Design a protein around this ligand. Structure first.
Ligand SMILES: [Zn+2]
Ligand SMILES: [Zn+2]
Lengths: 356, 356
């Protein structure tokens, strides 16, 4: 396989389905990328750089060897969690680790180097997720700095032969909700040139209507012939609507967070398995799901395990939720390939929101 | 298969290896019976009678259907946890549920009925685990009541046709550490007649030397041609020494409790995987273990998952610990069958206690 090749096999409206070929494997798109701890998984750079540390991961053979996963891994830049969990400047961000108090600076160059030490296959440029709401001035300042940082990320990646020859680099569009800034950002990223283009800054609490409005004008600004990655999104209906707007790749903490907090995704909407109404429900979590949990165990038993505090319960919920997300993406890909995605999206929403 | 048939295939000293045939499957002995949530697993009667309730489990089809496990299940009587988590009399014990305050009485008859509603294959007579230390008078009074309760358990079990024809009933020897009381208890149980005989009252903090001393005289008092079940034991070295003393069956919370609290069992003794010394250790949890965890993942990665608070870490530790216990029992059975158990026990202790 090549280092990176994205091919579009079929289209319906703005939706696309296809493949990304990389040395470590093929990624079917639209793709959902689950947390590593699927054709591709996510590594959490901020977490890994603090425990066990990027140099230690490299000493242990890189992330693929460390976690026993030989297919592609996408790493984020580390910048978002630095703020979530500090001193900012044009150079980067400095911060102290709550784990041991140690000092750490993160810059475009250092982020790319950390991602190199981790050995990931898709590397994210280092940028800022602009807070929401943002004024036009602040959104512009933030986006302009992120574009300067995108060039620095590009140059740092290109300087590391093993990385340049074997990994791929994605740039991130910013600009908050402002069409002109989104356009300026897309133009700057395309001038630098990246293997793929993320839509950043939209997992920030703005609500689905606003997210979709921004996607309506933002995704067409990106190069059509490269993958489009919507970072941090989202619920099943977010994903369907984003695919309708041209997105090819997704990641979100929801399936795992929900799986640890008693929420299971189903074709009839999410359910709170701890609720008493499930104590005698012999149906599987979802009566169409093909996952191993739904082949074997009932809602009543999973309800019991979670209520009893048994770790097995959260594991089964999480396995189901991840598998559900992958089945959603499979149904999306098949429906686009078959020219019936518009009907699928309508049928999906009618059932998911009915909550039957 | 018959309702119950225990056959001894080979012996070495006091140790035996063989099989219990039951309708739902064959149990290879010596056997370790893990918690259900292996040829046979344990159901926790006290927990199940409070959530979801024995009648509810029966409505859902019994425990086998409820938890998706079609091989034999052994249930305890429920009495021990009633005390652990009240008013005692010759009739039984009354107690209030912390879960919802509800009132509950547990007697030999009610315990057998609950175990019937759960649908277990091996039913334990209802008795008291005498506290330790106990004076001779108190140990005798407790044991005498338990023997009266053993007869009531026998009669209640025999009254339920489905249970009498399809399940098995074990009686429990008590008597604390006193040889004469252990003998009286064995005599009373044999006069009533049971399918198997447990040694009760020895998972009570007395220490291994004392436990082994009591087993030395207690196990020979039980019928030789029936299984001998040491309740609540134990660590790997406890198990080996108990097999050397004629025990055929074991259960213990240790593999699961340790698995949730960072302790992994290995042929070189237990390890505390959270310790910093494992942060770069690329070896599996145990370098001979055949379990799926040890085939795939390193100590360093499991250490990382647990330190990160990822549920996956405790799941992997627990899978390994259970599998280790089953590999221990397999090695015990093979060595007895091959006439080299004495050598195995010596080699096991030398390595396990070396802690290399
Ligand atoms: Zn499922
Ligand atoms: Zn193992």
């Amino acid at each position: 396989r090549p280092r990176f090749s994205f091919s579009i096999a079929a289209r319906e409206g703005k939706a696309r389905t296809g493949t990304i070929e990389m040395k470590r494997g093929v990624i079917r798109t639209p793709a959902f990328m689950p947390v590593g701890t699927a054709d591709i998984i996510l590594g959490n750079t901020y977490h890994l750089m603090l425990r066990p540390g990027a140099e230690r991961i490299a000493k242990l053979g890189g992330l693929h060897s460390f976690m026993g996963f030989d297919r592609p891994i996408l790493t984020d830049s580390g910048g978002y969690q630095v703020m979530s969990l500090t001193k900012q400047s044009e150079e980067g961000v400095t911060f102290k680790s709550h784990l041991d108090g140690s000092r750490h600076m993160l810059s475009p160059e250092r982020s790319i180097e950390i991602q190199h030490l981790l050995g990931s296959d898709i590397v994210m440029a280092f940028d800022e997720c602009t807070p929401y709401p943002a004024t036009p001035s602040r959104a512009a300042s933030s986006m302009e700095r992120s574009m300067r940082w995108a060039k620095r990320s590009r140059d740092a990646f290109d300087s590391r032969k093993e990385q340049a020859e074997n990994a791929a680099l994605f740039g991130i569009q910013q600009g908050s909700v402002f069409e002109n800034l989104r356009q300026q950002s897309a133009d700057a990223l395309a001038e630098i040139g990246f293997d793929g283009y993320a839509v950043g800054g939209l997992a920030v609490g703005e609500g689905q209507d606003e997210m979709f409005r921004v996607l309506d004008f933002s995704v067409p600004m990106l190069p059509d012939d490269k993958p489009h990655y919507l970072m941090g999104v989202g619920k099943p209906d977010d994903i369907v609507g984003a695919v309708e707007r041209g997105i090819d790749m997704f990641d979100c903490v929801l399936p795992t967070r929900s799986g640890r907090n008693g929420q299971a995704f189903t074709w009839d909407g999410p359910i709170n398995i701890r609720n008493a109404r499930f104590s005698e429900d012999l149906k599987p979590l979802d009566s169409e799901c093909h996952c191993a949990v739904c082949q074997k165990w009932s809602r009543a038993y999973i309800h019991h395990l979670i209520r009893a505090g048994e770790i097995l319960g959260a594991m089964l919920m999480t396995e189901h939720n991840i598998a559900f997300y992958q089945q959603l993406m499979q149904k999306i890909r098949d429906s686009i390939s078959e020219g019936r995605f518009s009907q699928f999206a309508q049928d999906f929403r009618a059932r998911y929101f009915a909550r039957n």
